[PDB]
Structure 1
Amino acid sequence: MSYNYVVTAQKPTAVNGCVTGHFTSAEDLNLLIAKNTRLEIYVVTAEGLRPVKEVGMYGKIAVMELFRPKGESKDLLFILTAKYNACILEYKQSGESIDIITRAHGNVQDRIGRPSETGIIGIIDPECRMIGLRLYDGLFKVIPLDRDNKELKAFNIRLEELHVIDVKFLYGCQAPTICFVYQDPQGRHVKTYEVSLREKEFNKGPWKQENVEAEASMVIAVPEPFGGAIIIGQESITYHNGDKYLAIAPPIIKQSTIVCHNRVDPNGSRYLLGDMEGRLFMLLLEKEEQMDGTVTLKDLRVELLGETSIAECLTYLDNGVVFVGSRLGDSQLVKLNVDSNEQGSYVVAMETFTNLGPIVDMCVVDLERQGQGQLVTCSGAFKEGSLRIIRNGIGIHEHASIDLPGIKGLWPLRSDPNRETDDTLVLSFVGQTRVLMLNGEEVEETELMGFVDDQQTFFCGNVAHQQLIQITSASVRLVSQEPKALVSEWKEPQAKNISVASCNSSQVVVAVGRALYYLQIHPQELRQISHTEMEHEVACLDITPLGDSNGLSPLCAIGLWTDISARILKLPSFELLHKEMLGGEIIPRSILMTTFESSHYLLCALGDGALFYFGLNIETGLLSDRKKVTLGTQPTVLRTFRSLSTTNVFACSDRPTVIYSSNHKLVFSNVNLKEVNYMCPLNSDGYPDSLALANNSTLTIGTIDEIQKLHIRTVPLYESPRKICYQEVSQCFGVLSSRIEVQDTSGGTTALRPSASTQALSSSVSSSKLFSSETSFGEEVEVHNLLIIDQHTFEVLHAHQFLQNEYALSLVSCKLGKDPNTYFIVGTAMVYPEEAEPKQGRIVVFQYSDGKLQTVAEKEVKGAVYSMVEFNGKLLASINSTVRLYEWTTEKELRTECNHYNNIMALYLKTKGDFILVGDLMRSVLLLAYKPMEGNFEEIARDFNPNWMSAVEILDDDNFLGAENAFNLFVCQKDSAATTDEERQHLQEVGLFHLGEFVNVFCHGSLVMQPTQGSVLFGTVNGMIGLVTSLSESWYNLLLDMQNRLNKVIKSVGKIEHSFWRSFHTERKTEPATGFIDGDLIESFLDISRPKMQEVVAATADDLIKVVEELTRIH
């Protein structure tokens, strides 16, 4: 009944784990990074990293490890998902195609038992004789790794302990040995066992049971020369190996906690350690040589090494370059020096990697007043927390825009000898060519008396060797520039008007009638060299330097009008090489072949907007990949701009979209402009990196920003942002943030770092007089701050200090009552460490004047303020399982009217028309009606069978949507039945779905300009952005049929069936998908190969790729 759709906007960015080893070959050094559901592979070079492969799994990755069984060159990978899918995979590079096969499969789920804290742990034998797993408490799963057992059969072993923290297999033992740390009454211990897979029981470890300091959570297994283990905690680094015992207690640790490690020395002499707030460490293992026995160590030494972000995963790579893996902030790549610079730091960074992190809140804001808003989020954390301005497409920066009608061509020229940046531009209206002169910001007209002024030409610019070119239907001619006059004249010896020509930088190719004249532009004179009539008509040409040649192109390309085809053909003698046919019949209007990387591309832009591809190489020119794609309706020309050393081509279509190649694939990033026709570069001194461009009636020039689809501009604040609001008439933003602060011995607390929270241009402090009622000498406290940020320059114009320790929760800007003024309104809650439930809060309303910040009214509120929204002209709030409505009087006051206190922890809240959806923490969605006549709340419908919601919104006036903490979606619906006595307070779950992620905020709006109904965006903890919309009957039925015919055949990496994962799940309750369409699958239809699409349903293929296309652009 309820027909919906969910798709991906931006893949997650947080990093959950990273390891190194040997996938690509035995002599490569790989870096493996695991996202939420994404795996990516990096191989090491001398300057940094490089990507090779990207894969997605139908499950949440929880275990990732490398191992080397006997009798093969490289390692093997073991992965265990969140629904306990167990797999063995490995790396196959066969030719150029890369694929990863499943040399095993299985499911290790049980019937009775409880998933526990600390999640899943997966370890592997140093001799690779089994694989251990902790899944449920008190029960340890062992996988045998004999040559048989393709199905990953397992077996169970009972444990005398139920609470396991960490587990690793020891080094240099006779038979597979386990040593691990567990939790029980009377502290935590480390204690060891021996397995016997023949008789399936734990026998005895090599040494006895001892004790460890109360909060160790981190175990390192020492390699062969020393053996034993390293135990890391707070004020403890320890070594155990049989009987020998040693430890150190460095005084540095007190303030911060260690997180990750990676062994630096294969021998095991130095170690890397990652801190909870940035300082990377180094640990020292000092060894002695016995006179006759094996090596042994004396002691342990630490040293403060440098500064980094917060680390989640940490790997010493080699030669003093180290990856820092961050989940709460930007990850970076670091170089360690041999000599410490000033302040004594060895660290030098080379790259940084952006991470939206936990998207706490967001709003949709439209800056430049067009029909396209942009999203601003509250990203990052304690020391990296910033503001991100996520913009779809690149923003233009216009300088000289004039409404100039349609322009066929527009060229530059150089009026001086071959000096620096050009000084002239050449126009061309509908049927002639006009020459300008560009002496600065002004525009002027001056016709040179050496050119034509009444008839259109194809080429006007220069190639080389102090001369000018004249390419025309009526004549071909060359121009001398010192006289600025004419040197010679030529005409076509057929009196026939040319169709098209071609020349970029060294030679002209002109195509007349069925034949084609040729001459490369010689100094001061010209002679025919090459000539060959084409069997059928010629439509387009392309001549360009492709590499080690100063303009002279060995090859030539030819386009065709009626039945589109490319012909690889030599320039010098115009001999045929190959024939290759292309689809469609609609008319082309340009083709280009251009270099970006070692794999050359030729790109043809067709008349429907569809952009097609054939392959070209200078030596032979065999056909590379091929795929049917479409675009905007208006016909398209591609011609190239200059951006970088690997600069790329632009295009003209319905709406300008610049294609970009990142590693080897073409990215389809758009840009914010209405329509375009034609281009050329301008590199003036005052216009350093601009482009001259023609439109239907407009001229646009500007500057070029980034290349990939999403523009992020990081604005550092050193602030932990919470929520954000807009107030347009005030020409600014309102942002909440909150600061890390330690109490000093003097009672008062000063600071830890300089922050915008205290570095405000002007500041003010809350001055309440209604709170009146213990902090220690050294401890952590938290201070909260309102930030007004200039909407144009993104600088802190002002910052307001809330009271000490007031934990501010909510923000809104609206007009209330009959007041014409716009305000900033905050709901807060004085949180206490000792108690457990907020008893109070204030509702402060702010006037932000010309440059000052005023305060109006307080009206203390008897509890926390989880959510608010202006109802119609009233103020609707949610306070501690209550919902309330408020009125704005004329005398600048606020009064209560009607209450409702049946719920428990009514937290999320949305309104539509005259109905209220109150989301809940634990019970369910629930609906209210505001009844105007006598004026209070009256329940319409509810929902039983409780769920733990994490976001709630109103899709339409009749169905309702929520999201819950077990990573699932569901669209509720009203039941249309009679007997309205009790079952009309019952709402109907109609859709079921396993999203896989945690949803933090829902918002109406769309990140696109100005097939389905409704539009919604949400942001997740892992930094993903998702979108949901409703559907009608026909596309739903079609697409679910297609979903069956696609998930029946598609191969998961662990060959899990696609139905199982997308299926709804919960601790207590599980059913397959219904009511929903999966965008992940549907837009995954495009990576499928052409033949295998004819073994797709085969009532055709194009009719459905058009469907997936139209559903794609909604995000």
Structure 2
Amino acid sequence: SYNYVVTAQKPTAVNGCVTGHFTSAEDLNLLIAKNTRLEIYVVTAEGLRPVKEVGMYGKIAVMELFRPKGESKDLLFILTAKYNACILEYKQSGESIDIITRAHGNVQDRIGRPSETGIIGIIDPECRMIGLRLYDGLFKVIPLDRDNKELKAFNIRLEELHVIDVKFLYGCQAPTICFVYQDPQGRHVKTYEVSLREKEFNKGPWKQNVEAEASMVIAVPEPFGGAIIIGQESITYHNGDKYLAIAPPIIKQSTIVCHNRVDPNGSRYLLGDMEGRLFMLLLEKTLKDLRVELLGETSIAECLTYLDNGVVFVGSRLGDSQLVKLNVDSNEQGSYVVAMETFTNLGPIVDMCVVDLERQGQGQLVTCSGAFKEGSLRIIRNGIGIHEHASIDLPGIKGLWPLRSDPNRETDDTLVLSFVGQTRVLMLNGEEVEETELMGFVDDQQTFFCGNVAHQQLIQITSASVRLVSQEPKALVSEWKEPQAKNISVASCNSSQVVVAVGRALYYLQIHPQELRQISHTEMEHEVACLDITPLGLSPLCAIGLWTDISARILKLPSFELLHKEMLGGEIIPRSILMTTFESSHYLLCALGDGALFYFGLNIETGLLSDRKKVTLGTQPTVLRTFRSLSTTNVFACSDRPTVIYSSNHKLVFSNVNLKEVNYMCPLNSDGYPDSLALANNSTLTIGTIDEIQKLHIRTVPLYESPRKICYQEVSQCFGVLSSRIEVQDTTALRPSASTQALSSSVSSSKEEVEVHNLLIIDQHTFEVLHAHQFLQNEYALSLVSCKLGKDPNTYFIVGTAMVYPEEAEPKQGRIVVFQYSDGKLQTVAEKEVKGAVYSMVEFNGKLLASINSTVRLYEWTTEKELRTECNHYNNIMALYLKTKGDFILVGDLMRSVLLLAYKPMEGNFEEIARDFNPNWMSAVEILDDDNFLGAENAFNLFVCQKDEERQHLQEVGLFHLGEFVNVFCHGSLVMTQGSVLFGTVNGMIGLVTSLSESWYNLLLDMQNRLNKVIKSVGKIEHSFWRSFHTKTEPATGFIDGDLIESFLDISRPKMQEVVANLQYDDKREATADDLIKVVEELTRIH
């Protein structure tokens, strides 16, 4: 098996946030860590200015800014989870930005038990050294002698094997570290000093049984000195002979988990609760006492950073991050917190599903995201977005035209709108739209075109006539009518050249001052459908599409004589046709009423249409329309599924536009709406800017409780969501939540903190909670599915459950509840008591498969409307995971034991096919196909078992360090390689897995290696080290880092040429840069 993994969506969860002077000494920076990503901003009055963002080949585990003696600005120390240490510097060389690596080395020890309080990394305030507590019984020291470019470092044995937190202190004759530890007597604080000179600890200034549950340590700066120690109940200062202590009522509620220093003084600190409380702690003065104020509520903070001007960065892992404003203990109101800005954080993605929501043939991902109030559904859609600036209700718009009403202003001030038998004119002044008359333009006739034309004039082309109007002193200066007064049926005009068409006939007029002169006439072999006349001054040809021969055609400049004449096929007519110019070539596009779009290369001199390709874009008819997007032209295909059409290296691309149907559009360049679009649909005119390239767009739906599983019932037009709110014993809520705020509501009729489970029913379009069904007291909802069973036509939400009692370890009882959502409410259609926890379920060939502890059990759905067992299968593992393909069944436990059962219809029971037991923690599994099984496993790895007598063992074909923790896999794709499996992750990264042909695998593997020679890596970390399956540590196999491959496009033109130097390539021969460019761009369009 040959797989390709790529990032659809980088991790969003913040796990570190530091400030300092990194970019310049004169700039204040905020650095943010999002697992493998490092964002760098500059703090402003206006907010946060982004500056440089980079990935690492590493999970950022330590991130500290420091300034060693005689350096203009701060340097950044980072240590990864694989013990990659680096010192980094910000390098602006001209108009480009780069993060250069001053030093790097791997600080790992061969023999070492990693500490239970994780990696801790600290730098002394003189910047003599870096301390790393990596392992129990050891303290690693990296001296900061400027010659130490390899980060060579020594260890010192600690006596104390269970260290909790540790800092370096301020104001000491020598570098001194302070730390809480635990031995079988109790929890105490100690200090040592650190001599590089001796590579050893000397005993230090002071010591202390401190609070049972003391956890945090804070180095106080030099105005006082000393250390603050936070616990559950206490906050204790310590120093030589000085000592304070408090236990305010306000924090005994939830534990403090993050802190931050507000001023260099050390007067104030920000404290971070585990549930969102944000406190100040003030050091009152010398050092008299400690006051603690409760400032307000934030998102549940992983880290905090005071930014100055009373603004605070709140980094979160469980919900959105924030900038919040603080207020001083003001004369009128107590010090309080206000949310200034929110940044999206998808993770943790705990479950998701893919839904074709818009009906467009475009998947949308809907995730269960967040926890404990930060809980949320997130709707993730792929596309080009429209930034909307104005909206106008006007139904029945048939056409849009921008127009310059004042000839010595360089900018549109008019929008003209056609309706059935009716024309209307909107004038624009800044952002004020007013319908008005345009003298000379008729209003009781349907316009087919208007706009500016040569010799300082406006033209309007009605069904009745072709009016022509003076820019100055507007009035009619010309009119052209059809000989026997017949209606103009199709119209097309440019700068200086009209080509109307009447029924089967078509005339060709030209625009000259105060006169429109008839030049040609002609007939046509069937009725005329659509015209174009675009210059590529005056255009020497004219495109046509016709009604019966269903055919696109080119014509001559005045004669109207056929130049190419291609038959398009089928029974549906042309709807629009467009001669356009992409890249530096010329094309002809033509659209059918059924949604089909055919494109041809064009030859302006001869007329030769070449290389027909087809594509289908949204089944309603399609109007094509030219616009400018950054010094180049695109095409906007107004339809069911609106679409922009650009050309990336001489092959066209169809980025879809992120809107419900657009019928007509035109570009608009006003003073109030510069470089904009005007879109109309059946009910509304919209005015907006447009994004250049595609992106992922995230709609958020707050639940204010934990969502846990989700599935979609298309017939009901709604989502099932298992959720979980926390009440406290009386039992009452802590806040209003999705389940307590539902329209309709219910509770299951029967057979200190508490969890209460519900099945929410949420509207597909509006995401209103329509109903909230509460399960029993002590009942824990585990699994959810929405399916049809047996001969029954009705569709049901089915939930598996378990009965959790604190006395009981392994649950002895549970339920399989079948529900129907039919009225606004939810009917319990059937229970089924079961002697165990229902961990999983799956619709299985019209029957219900379901794990109950170690048993896999198949149920049929009776006409009596009850669940009846067919067969069973007792395992020697616990069936946590259940996935199927056809009659094949995949079972897994938490410990990476996997089975492969098969149903046998002729035999009535299940049979074992294959198995693999290999002890490791498994978080998710998926069936890639009948033979291959994708899984996620401990230390952020992906792995692939393959199927292929004593061949019921499963071969290990795939290994890869992802760097993310996968909760859910699910088959689907967010676009309109073989297969697509999306996965969601704890940091809110989303990834895609697909499969490759061996040929392609081999090519791309070579190319990774060529790439790794050429691409600068931040901590100088080898890509191979990074992707190595790690816990054992082995090279990755049968997995292509698509992120690596995609980075090819970002390298300079010569680095490409270097990468492809003597690369054998199929069609083999010596390959080009442009050969691989168009391959890699084909690979970007799977996600």
Q: TM-score range by the shorter chain?
A: 0.7 to 0.9
Assess, with a 3 A threshold, how the Cα gap between structure 1 residues 671 and 245 changes in structure 2: closer, same or farther: same
Assess, with a 3 A threshold, how the Cα gap between structure 1 residues 701 and 146 changes in structure 2: closer, same or farther: closer
Deviation at 1:1008, TM superposition (A): 1.8
Which deviates the most, 111-120 or 526-535? 526-535
Deviation at 1:1045, TM superposition (A): 1.2
Assess, with a 3 A threshold, how the Cα gap between structure 1 residues 790 and 452 changes in structure 2: closer, same or farther: closer
Assess, with a 3 A threshold, how the Cα gap between structure 1 residues 338 and 626 changes in structure 2: closer, same or farther: farther
Q: Is the 8 A contact 2:816 2:832 kept in 1?
A: yes
Q: Is the 8 A contact 2:63 2:76 kept in 1?
A: yes
Deviation at 1:1103, TM superposition (A): 1.4
Assess, with a 3 A threshold, how the Cα gap between structure 1 residues 459 and 257 changes in structure 2: closer, same or farther: same
Which deviates the most, 917-926 or 1032-1041? 917-926
Partner of 2:166: helix, strand, or coil?
strand
Deviation at 1:588, TM superposition (A): 23
Assess, with a 3 A threshold, how the Cα gap between structure 1 residues 417 and 1060 changes in structure 2: closer, same or farther: closer
Assess, with a 3 A threshold, how the Cα gap between structure 1 residues 77 and 417 changes in structure 2: closer, same or farther: closer
Assess, with a 3 A threshold, how the Cα gap between structure 1 residues 370 and 686 changes in structure 2: closer, same or farther: farther
Assess, with a 3 A threshold, how the Cα gap between structure 1 residues 1088 and 431 changes in structure 2: closer, same or farther: farther
Assess, with a 3 A threshold, how the Cα gap between structure 1 residues 158 and 438 changes in structure 2: closer, same or farther: closer
Partner of 1:992: helix, strand, or coil?
strand
Q: Is the 8 A contact 1:928 1:938 kept in 2?
A: yes
Which deviates the most, 1079-1088 or 880-889? 880-889
Q: Residues of 2 paired with 1:241 and 1:662: CA distance?
A: 66
* Greater strand proportion: 2
Q: Is the 8 A contact 1:426 1:435 kept in 2?
A: yes
Partner of 1:938: helix, strand, or coil?
strand
Which deviates the most, 456-465 or 14-23? 456-465
Partner of 1:1035: helix, strand, or coil?
helix
Assess, with a 3 A threshold, how the Cα gap between structure 1 residues 266 and 631 changes in structure 2: closer, same or farther: farther
Assess, with a 3 A threshold, how the Cα gap between structure 1 residues 646 and 722 changes in structure 2: closer, same or farther: farther
* TM-score under structure 1 length normalisation: 0.77
Task: Specify the alignment match of 2:1076 in structure 1.
Answer: 1104
Query: Residues 988-1027 of structure 1, C-alpha deviation per residue, up to 9 Å, x if partnerless?
Result: 1112211111110111111222xx2111111000001111
Which deviates the most, 128-137 or 645-654? 645-654
Query: Residues 703-727 of structure 1, C-alpha deviation per residue, up to 9 Å, x if partnerless?
Result: 9899972222111221210111122
Q: Is the 8 A contact 1:922 1:948 kept in 2?
A: yes
Assess, with a 3 A threshold, how the Cα gap between structure 1 residues 610 and 248 changes in structure 2: closer, same or farther: farther
Unaligned runs of 5+ in 2: 1062-1070
Assess, with a 3 A threshold, how the Cα gap between structure 1 residues 1078 and 573 changes in structure 2: closer, same or farther: farther
Assess, with a 3 A threshold, how the Cα gap between structure 1 residues 49 and 557 changes in structure 2: closer, same or farther: farther
Q: Residues of 2 paired with 1:10 and 1:909: CA distance?
A: 27
Task: Specify the alignment match of 2:1047 in structure 1.
Answer: 1084
Assess, with a 3 A threshold, how the Cα gap between structure 1 residues 214 and 670 changes in structure 2: closer, same or farther: farther
Q: Is the 8 A contact 2:600 2:613 kept in 1?
A: no
Q: Is the 8 A contact 2:649 2:1078 kept in 1?
A: no
Q: Is the 8 A contact 1:925 1:952 kept in 2?
A: no
Partner of 1:1080: helix, strand, or coil?
helix
Task: Specify the alignment match of 1:1094 in structure 2.
Answer: 1057
Assess, with a 3 A threshold, how the Cα gap between structure 1 residues 1071 and 398 changes in structure 2: closer, same or farther: closer
Deviation at 1:429, TM superposition (A): 16
Query: Residues 155-209 of structure 1, C-alpha deviation per residue, up to 9 Å, x if partnerless?
Result: 1111111122211111011111111111222322110011222222111111233
Which deviates the most, 681-690 or 211-220? 681-690
Q: Residues of 1 paired with 2:555 and 2:248: CA distance?
A: 74
Partner of 1:418: helix, strand, or coil?
coil
Assess, with a 3 A threshold, how the Cα gap between structure 1 residues 822 and 496 changes in structure 2: closer, same or farther: closer
Deviation at 1:69, TM superposition (A): 1.1
RMSD across aligned positions (CA) = 9.8
Deviation at 1:1033, TM superposition (A): 2.1
Which deviates the most, 559-568 or 1080-1089? 559-568
Partner of 1:520: helix, strand, or coil?
strand
Query: Residues 496-547 of structure 1, C-alpha deviation per residue, up to 9 Å, x if partnerless?
Result: 999999999999999999999999999999999999999999999999999x
Task: Choose the corresponding residue for 2:957, options 960, 971, 990.
Answer: 990
Partner of 1:676: helix, strand, or coil?
coil
Q: Residues of 1 paired with 2:626 and 2:432: CA distance?
A: 26
Partner of 1:251: helix, strand, or coil?
coil
Q: Residues of 1 paired with 2:192 and 2:605: CA distance?
A: 65
Which deviates the most, 663-672 or 235-244? 663-672
Task: Specify the alignment match of 2:102 in structure 1.
Answer: 103
Query: Residues 131-174 of structure 1, C-alpha deviation per residue, up to 9 Å, x if partnerless?
Result: 11011111111112112222111111111111222111110111
Assess, with a 3 A threshold, how the Cα gap between structure 1 residues 1105 and 582 changes in structure 2: closer, same or farther: farther
Q: Is the 8 A contact 1:920 1:948 kept in 2?
A: no
Q: Residues of 1 paired with 2:660 and 2:929: CA distance?
A: 32
Which deviates the most, 40-49 or 644-653? 644-653
Deviation at 1:481, TM superposition (A): 7.2
Deviation at 1:59, TM superposition (A): 1.0
Which deviates the most, 52-61 or 758-767? 758-767
Assess, with a 3 A threshold, how the Cα gap between structure 1 residues 240 and 526 changes in structure 2: closer, same or farther: farther
Deviation at 1:1055, TM superposition (A): 1.3
Assess, with a 3 A threshold, how the Cα gap between structure 1 residues 326 and 612 changes in structure 2: closer, same or farther: farther
Q: Residues of 1 paired with 2:415 and 2:368: CA distance?
A: 46
Q: Is the 8 A contact 1:668 1:709 kept in 2?
A: no
Q: Is the 8 A contact 2:360 2:618 kept in 1?
A: no
Deviation at 1:661, TM superposition (A): 18
Deviation at 1:1109, TM superposition (A): 1.2
Assess, with a 3 A threshold, how the Cα gap between structure 1 residues 135 and 501 changes in structure 2: closer, same or farther: farther
Task: Specify the alignment match of 1:71 in structure 2.
Answer: 70
Q: Is the 8 A contact 2:878 2:892 kept in 1?
A: no
The within-5 A match list for 1:322-361 is 322-338=312-328, 344=334, 346-361=336-351
Deviation at 1:751, TM superposition (A): 2.9
Q: Residues of 2 paired with 1:335 and 1:614: CA distance?
A: 57
Q: Residues of 2 paired with 1:581 and 1:767: CA distance?
A: 67
Deviation at 1:39, TM superposition (A): 0.4
Q: Is the 8 A contact 2:1008 2:1044 kept in 1?
A: yes
Deviation at 1:667, TM superposition (A): 14
Assess, with a 3 A threshold, how the Cα gap between structure 1 residues 106 and 279 changes in structure 2: closer, same or farther: same
Q: Is the 8 A contact 1:125 1:169 kept in 2?
A: yes
Partner of 2:637: helix, strand, or coil?
strand
Assess, with a 3 A threshold, how the Cα gap between structure 1 residues 151 and 715 changes in structure 2: closer, same or farther: same
Query: Residues 360-395 of structure 1, C-alpha deviation per residue, up to 9 Å, x if partnerless?
Result: 111122223332232211111111212111112268
Assess, with a 3 A threshold, how the Cα gap between structure 1 residues 97 and 612 changes in structure 2: closer, same or farther: farther
Partner of 2:621: helix, strand, or coil?
coil
Task: Specify the alignment match of 1:755 in structure 2.
Answer: 737
Task: Specify the alignment match of 2:1003 in structure 1.
Answer: 1038
The within-5 A match list for 1:486-501 is 486=476
Q: Is the 8 A contact 1:340 1:346 kept in 2?
A: no
Assess, with a 3 A threshold, how the Cα gap between structure 1 residues 261 and 589 changes in structure 2: closer, same or farther: farther
Assess, with a 3 A threshold, how the Cα gap between structure 1 residues 633 and 932 changes in structure 2: closer, same or farther: closer
Assess, with a 3 A threshold, how the Cα gap between structure 1 residues 171 and 495 changes in structure 2: closer, same or farther: farther
Which deviates the most, 1081-1090 or 631-640? 631-640
Q: Residues of 2 paired with 1:438 and 1:11: CA distance?
A: 42
Deviation at 1:763, TM superposition (A): 2.1
Task: Choose the corresponding residue for 2:988, options 997, 1009, 1023.
Answer: 1023
Assess, with a 3 A threshold, how the Cα gap between structure 1 residues 563 and 284 changes in structure 2: closer, same or farther: farther
Deviation at 1:754, TM superposition (A): 2.4
Q: Residues of 2 paired with 1:556 and 1:721: CA distance?
A: 59
Q: Is the 8 A contact 2:441 2:467 kept in 1?
A: no
Deviation at 1:750, TM superposition (A): 3.0
Partner of 2:1000: helix, strand, or coil?
helix
Q: Residues of 2 paired with 1:131 and 1:379: CA distance?
A: 37
Unaligned runs of 5+ in 1: 288-295, 770-778, 975-980
Assess, with a 3 A threshold, how the Cα gap between structure 1 residues 457 and 104 changes in structure 2: closer, same or farther: farther
Q: Is the 8 A contact 2:375 2:707 kept in 1?
A: yes
Query: Residues 1060-1085 of structure 1, C-alpha deviation per residue, up to 9 Å, x if partnerless?
Result: 1112222xx22212222110101111
Q: Is the 8 A contact 1:274 1:280 kept in 2?
A: yes
Task: Specify the alignment match of 2:669 in structure 1.
Answer: 683
Assess, with a 3 A threshold, how the Cα gap between structure 1 residues 513 and 285 changes in structure 2: closer, same or farther: farther
Q: Is the 8 A contact 2:745 2:825 kept in 1?
A: no
Query: Residues 443-478 of structure 1, C-alpha deviation per residue, up to 9 Å, x if partnerless?
Result: 999999968999999995369999847999999998
Q: Residues of 2 paired with 1:297 and 1:556: CA distance?
A: 88
Deviation at 1:223, TM superposition (A): 0.9
Partner of 1:627: helix, strand, or coil?
strand
Partner of 1:113: helix, strand, or coil?
coil
Assess, with a 3 A threshold, how the Cα gap between structure 1 residues 485 and 866 changes in structure 2: closer, same or farther: same
Q: Is the 8 A contact 1:615 1:621 kept in 2?
A: no
Assess, with a 3 A threshold, how the Cα gap between structure 1 residues 36 and 667 changes in structure 2: closer, same or farther: farther
Q: Is the 8 A contact 1:33 1:39 kept in 2?
A: yes
Partner of 1:700: helix, strand, or coil?
strand
